[PDB]
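Researcher: Let's walk through a ligand-bound prediction step by step. First, I give you the protein sequence. Second, the SMILES string for Elaidic acid. Third, you return the three-dimensional complex as structure tokens. Ready?
Model: Ready.
Researcher: Here are steps one and two:
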Amino acid sequence: MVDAFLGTWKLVDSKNFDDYMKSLGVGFATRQVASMTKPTTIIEKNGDILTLKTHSTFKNTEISFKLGVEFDETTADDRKVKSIVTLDGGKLVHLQKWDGQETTLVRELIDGKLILTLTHGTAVCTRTYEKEA
Ligand SMILES: CCCCCCCC/C=C/CCCCCCCC(=O)O
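Model: Step three, the predicted complex:
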């Protein structure tokens, strides 16, 4: 059900990431470096366990989870959140909760590209990834 998402993906477009980061309280210097990074996202599965790596010249993260089962996560910007990832309408929907706040990270495949939509507050960022062979 999550198979088309699997593989190695490289960032090729980003819209409103600064707005999203600023909404989360990320400092200007971090936003500045992040605005010039092009991460690689690697999504792998082993049975019911997905592992999602995000690699860059700036920061790296890795999470492992089962769909539909809450997990603790420490984000790239050091938020300690309660997370859950599901499939909804064919999209991979990652919801993070902390301090009564929420943000969603929604991934969907359009014409073979992976679109990541990040929403926090009123900020909506769209990042496009292309698959590495
Ligand atoms: C791990 C790569 C880090 C990139 C720099 C991020 C700076 C700190 C910002 C944190 C806010 C949360 C961002 C989540 C999305 C990361 C980029 C993406 O996967 O397309």
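Researcher: And what stands out?
Model: The two ends are 21 Å apart (CA to CA). The first helix runs from residue 17 to 23.
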